[model samples]
Every structure is written in C-alpha cells, then in structure tokens.
Target: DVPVNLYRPNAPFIGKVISNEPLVKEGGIGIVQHIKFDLTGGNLKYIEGQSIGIIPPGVDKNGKPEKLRLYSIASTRHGDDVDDKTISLCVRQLEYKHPESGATVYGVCSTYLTHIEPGSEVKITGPVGKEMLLPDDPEANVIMLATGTGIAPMRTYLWRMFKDAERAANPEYQFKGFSWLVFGVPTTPNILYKEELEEIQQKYPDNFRLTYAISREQKNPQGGRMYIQDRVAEHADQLWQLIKNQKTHTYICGLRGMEEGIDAALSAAAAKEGVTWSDYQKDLKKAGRWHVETS
Candidate 1:
C-alpha cells in the first residue's frame, strides 16, 4: 500500500496519550518509555516499521513553529490492545552534558513525548515507511539485530510472529521457520520488553533464539566491553551460513556507529567462504533480504 498522510504536515491529527510508562528498570540508565496514543478519532493506520511525526508545541530559537520529528512506531498495526485503535512508540528521553558548560541538555521533541500527559492533545502525522517491512513469506528465516530503542521494529516482528492474539488475528499468516535475535544493551535491565520477549523465546525455543550483549555486565573474548558487533562476530560463522540461504531476511537497526564493526565482523566470515562482504551485501540489498533502519 502506498503511504499517505492521514493528517498532512499542516493539518496534523491531534491524538491523546492513553499511556506513557517507563520501560527501564532500576539499574538501567536514562529514560525510555512505552508511550501509546489513542488513535480512535482518526484513521491513522500504519504497518510495522513506519514512523509518526510529532510537532512539539513550542517555537524554535528563531521563533518559529517547531518542526516535526519522526519517531518509529513501536507497536504492531493491531497495537498493544489488538483493537486497532492506537499506536505506540518506544522513545528515549535524550539527555546529554553540554560540550562547554556541562549543562544537561534534553531533546525537545523526545522530552515532550516522554513526559506527555495522558488525555492531552498531541499533534501527530505520518504512518510512513516501507524499507523495513516484513516479507510476505511466512516461513522465511528471519534475523533481527537491534540496540536500545531500535528494538521498536523488532517488537513488531516478534509480536506478529508469535503473539497469540496476533497469530489469531491473522489466520492467513503462520511462522514456522527459524528466527534469531541478537539484541545489544548496556545492562540486563536495559533489555526493554524483557518479560514479553523472554515469554516468546521460552514458548518457542525451537523456532526462536535470543542473544544479548550487555556491555557493562559482560566481556568479550578479548576482555573488552561486549557490544553488538562482538556478538555478531561470535556468531558470524553461523550467521554467514544462514545468509547463504536465499530465504533468510536480516534486519538491523540502531546507532550507525556500530555498522563499521558489524561490517568488519561479517566481512571475515564472508571471506572464509571466498565471498566479498560488500558484494554479497549488495546482492542481499537487491534481493530485499538485507533490511536496515539505523539512526
């Protein structure tokens, strides 16, 4: 389906927040929230991997209306309730120490989102994107790699693949192939949607595999802080074998900084098969097998 703005740039829909709850646990750093908005008043339908633009309610430094900031849709089309009347976002309250005076800086749009009051009107637009859409083949092998809020889309995939309500909703779809997820976070508590994710993994151990890279709580073979790429390297051989299969579709999202290390890790594995990583990735891209949505 072609993407359309339910509420255009200027006439954005005013949606109300149904819930805005914290996701991080006691030991986790920073604030991340599972914010759901009531979409009952409009037909703001969206598929997985799309984003919604939020217009912050204030003027910029130049005294102009705030620009729209897009955030990934964190829930499935059926939403958390399976009622199709809402949309959810996994947002991090952006915070940083100023480069000079060390004053803490918070992201405007993100802060507004994370602290939004329930029942308050929020300007929203867009349910657009197609790059990270899941393939139609139900039995295709899937690989997901995400860090922090990047799990947004992966959450969509998992729920679509294994959530009972989701499966029941889409009778035409049934996943019966291998699925693997390699998630990276700073600590165990930082693993968002921990209970739900582990629930699926526990229920379908044969068809799904889960791996984590907790930097502060784990170390690599080289005795360094474990990162996502390290986990990729550790399993590169197996991942390479899977990639060799035409049925495999891999999705990667999160910080762009990790791409270099990830490419290096996969390069070595591809080299072992007498294949060039970049060349192989090109083919995957052409074949719609390699999906990436990094910030």
Candidate 2:
C-alpha cells in the first residue's frame, strides 16, 4: 500500500540538516540546492518520488507559523548514503518581481531551505505521494521526462537503478532494463546533478540513455530555443514504439506547460499509425504505466 500523511503539519518530525549544497553551479540560471536532512532520530521513511513537507521557521502577517511546503524527495528509499537515516530534496529558490512594486519577491519555504545551515533543526512532515513510484519489476523500462528541479525523483530512480552503493544494498532488485531520461534546462550549468548523471551514462551505456534539451544552447527544427517537448517531438515516433511495450513506464515531472506540447507531439506520431494518442494514453494510465507530477 502507498504511504500517505504519515506525519502531519501540526506535529512535525524535527530533523537536522545534514548538508545543503548548491546543485547549480556558476552560470546557472538560479539557485537550486540539494538538501539532505538527518532523520536518524526520526521515523520519516520515504520512497523515491515521494514528497515531504517542510515548515519554515517564521511567522506570517497574522503571527502564525509559516505553512508547510511539500518538496519532492530526491533520494532512494535507502537514502543518499545507502542508509535509512536520511532524506533529501532538490529545491530551486522561487524568485520573481512583484507586479506592482517591481520589487524582488522570494518563496518563503524555498528561501528558507536554500539558506538553512547545517546542523540546524527543521520541522519536517509527511513521507507522501505515490503517483511516481518505481515499478517493482527489475526489467521494467522507465522513460523519465523532467525539467529543472523536476530531476529530483529522476535522480532517486537513477540512484536506485544504477548507483554502486544502491546496487550493493538491494540484493533482490538488480536492474537489467533500459532507462531513458529526457532532461531539459536552460544551460549546461543549469543541469542539476550533471556529474552523477553523466557518470551513470558512462558506466551503464547499455542500460541507461541520457538526453539533454538546453533551451539556450540548443535549437529545435524551426531554430527556436530547445524545450523538452521539442526534444520529445523530435523523437516521438521512437517514444511511441516504446510506449506500446507493456513493460515501459513513462513518468513526467516538471513545468506544466510542457504537457500539452508533449501530447501534441505524441498525438501526431500515433496518428501516423492510425491510432489515437489520447485514447492510448488513457489505457496507459489505467494500466498504471503513465505517471505525471507537475507544478
């Protein structure tokens, strides 16, 4: 059964920040962090693709503590250390200009996490969400579509499927199937977890394929900025072929705008074969092969 709301906002589990490192490097678009919290003394257990709520340490205008914000967990069930005593998140600080004042505004929860110090105690709640869980079959094909911080769950899946420590720990779940990740970002530096991702590709060339859609550095067929959907469109036919396989599971996580474009691309591809993409997608969803989480 899927775990839901194990911990609630009113009584959150106090966790200590283990390390909050910058995922984006110089030349990156914005601040993104890979924050790992110490759950050694807590009872927070989460699987890959699950979300955990974080309560920032501050009061609002009404003098109430800030509300909880849910972040996608970026580590496997065994955690980053291959131990069960940690939880991690990939967060990009939300920053935008105020519409009227023209002043900079920042996201409360994201800002709190990005600037939080090590050893600091944080209020954490819930090991929630089940929509993006990994398939139990070791040979299942996973097609991951992600953009920016959406790479959180994808990272977890990759770690579970390819990380040396993770492999050593999971004796019964040796991955022997193909996994493809189509990741989009603005620049090379914006590619979160670039090193770890490339390492996996280098080591498991036959089992994993990594594709990048850099909006600023790459171009689409019309010579426009390359977006995730553009990349999907370029390879829609191949993706359609894979989607036809019952063993294939597709997970989409990232900006919601890419959804329509992805559908259009696949729709055109399916039409070529006299099949309707939306109808097929419905079947895939009913079969639990299509998963999506976006914001």
Candidate 3:
C-alpha cells in the first residue's frame, strides 16, 4: 500500500459546517453541510479557475485510512475573502449497497462531508491541479463543458467572471470574449443550479450561451437520446471554426469516456471540412485551446 503524507497543514484542521443542501434527491447527492474555515495559517491559495484537493481522512477498512481522492473547488477566490478564506465544493454522495459490508458504504468524502456537524473538523490538503487555470486575458473567450458535479470549477470560473464584470468601470473591463457552457445529465432533475446558470446567461447576454444535453429526458425528432458529444457534433462546424480562428478556449469536465467521444465528433467534423481530424486536434492541443478534468 502507498504511504500516507501525515505532515500536511490541512491534515489536522477543523472546519465548521455552514450550509448543507441536497442538489438532487434519491440517488442524487448533497454538498457539505455549509463549511467555513480560516486559511490564515494554511498553505492553499487559488486563482479564478484553479482546483483545490481535499485530502479527506481515509476510511478504516477493518481499520485504516484509505487513499485520498481530489476534488475541484467550486467556490471563487473573490467569495473566499468575505467567507473566511475558504472555498465551497460541490460534492455528491454515492449511496449504494456494499456487497462486502452490505452496510452501505457511502462515498468517502461525500458521507464525511454531509455528516459533518456544526463544529466538526475535516482534514484537507493542497489545491493540487493547475491544468485548468483561467487565462489572464480578460477578453479571452471560454467554453466550459461539464456533466453532473463536474460543473464545480466552471462555477468558480463564472463567479469570478461576474465579479470582474461588476468591478469594471466600463463594459470593456468585462471579459470581452464569448462564454459558452455545454452541460449534460440524465434528467432535468439532475440538472444542477439551472436557475443560477440562467441568471448568468441573462446578465451576460452578449457574451454567454448555455446549452443542455439531457440524455434521458431530451430526445431528437427521431427519438434519439442527446449526449454532450452529440451537442458538440451538432455545432461542430461552429466549434471547428472557432478552433481554426483561435477564438475560443475549451474546457471539459466529467466522466473519462466523454473526452474520446468529443474527440471523435470533432475529428469527423474537421474531416468534413477537408482537414484531417488529427491535424485539428494537434493544433488545438499545441495552442492550449483544449482543457479537461475527469473522474
């Protein structure tokens, strides 16, 4: 087994539960009962689009702390200043019957987070990943793609964008490029924070677009389920054009398999335009136009 790092700063800290709300009922999951923690002595700091990893205490298997899993911070740094130097994360509880224990082994972080009481202490660690960092250019166009809880980082990014717009002396200070989000889910009920997202879209009408690909609930005229890749394909020409013109930065977050699907779709679309799919993909990668985070 891998040895655990016990000397981390967040390893022995305590955080208070501030708010805990269910984003989905039944098999759906909820977030940490609200949490607020001081970071004055901590080692974690993040910008608009960076992610923080919570080194959750491992579960005792017969007796032991299991391996740590990383999650992206959904809260913005701008919000953290006023909220005790902490960021919010969107977590989902996986409630399923354990075949071995048969006692229902909940998700490690989810159960720990949701069950945290007002004064409970939860150990955490550094903000690990940096691949998804937001560009410094205020006018850079951004495209966010997410499904299920993958919206966490995108949420953080959007929150910062809104704050940036609010503080701008003129409209020009606002992120000048277009922002687009392609979110997918199995049902409408699973669509998280629809109203909040719509509000952002309304506020940035000139620079934002939000689209949903509900695979189970939404169907085409031929009764075909709509996947995120399908949505990407439907708009392939436009997306390819954006890539070719270097007018957009794409970010995808969600299940691992979705990336291949999107690649296939983009490849097919690019081929139609007389360019090899690999060429376009290579160009996008070289230009740092593609970014992804997966579970």
The candidate that wins on lDDT is 2
Model 1 segments more than 4 A misplaced:
none
Clashes of 3: 6
Estimate TM-scores for all models.
0.98, 0.97, 0.83
Ranking by lDDT: 2, 1, 3
How high is the lDDT of residue 112 in model 1?
A: 94
lDDT of 3 by residue, 1-295 (tens): 1112322553543444455566654553333233444454554455545554455665566776665556677776544344436656677765777787778767877677656555555566555566677776777888888988888788877766765433442243457677888998777767777777889888789878999998877875457898887788788777777766566788888888788878877788788879997777777777777787897
Better of 1 and 3 by lDDT: 1
Which of the predicted structures, 2 or 3, would earn the higher TM-score when compared with the native? 2
Q: What is the C-alpha RMSD of each candidate to the true structure, in Å?
A: 1.0, 1.1, 4.8
Per-candidate local distance difference test: 0.90, 0.93, 0.68
Q: Where does candidate 2 stray beyond 4 Å?
A: none
For candidate 1, the TM-score is: 0.98
Per-residue alpha-carbon lDDT of candidate 1 for residues 1-295, written as tens digits (9 for 90 to 100): 7465777778988898999999999989999999999998788888877888999989888999899988888998899999999999999999999999889999999999999889889899997777888877888999999999999999998898999999999887788888999999999889999999899999999889999999999999999999999999999999998888899999998998887888898899999879999999999999889999898
Report lDDT (Cα) of residue 78, candidate 3. 41
Tell me the deviation in Å of residue 248 in model 2.
0.7
Estimate candidate 2's alpha-carbon lDDT, on a 0 to 1 scale.
Answer: 0.93
Residue-wise lDDT of candidate 2 within 1-295, one digit each (tens)?
7667778988899999999999888998999999999998777787888999999988988998789988999999988999888989999999999999999999999999999999999999998887898998999999999999999999999999999999999998899999999999999999999999999999999999999999999999898999999999999999999998999999999998989999999999999999999999999999889999999
Query: Model 2 residue 48 lDDT?
Result: 84
Which 10 consecutive residues of model 2 have the lowest summed lDDT? 1-10
Among residues 3 or more apart in sequence or in different chains, the pairs in candidate 1 whose N, CA or C atoms overlap within 3 Å are: none
- Runs with alpha carbons beyond 4 Å of true place in candidate 3: 1-14, 25-43, 80-84, 97-105, 163-173
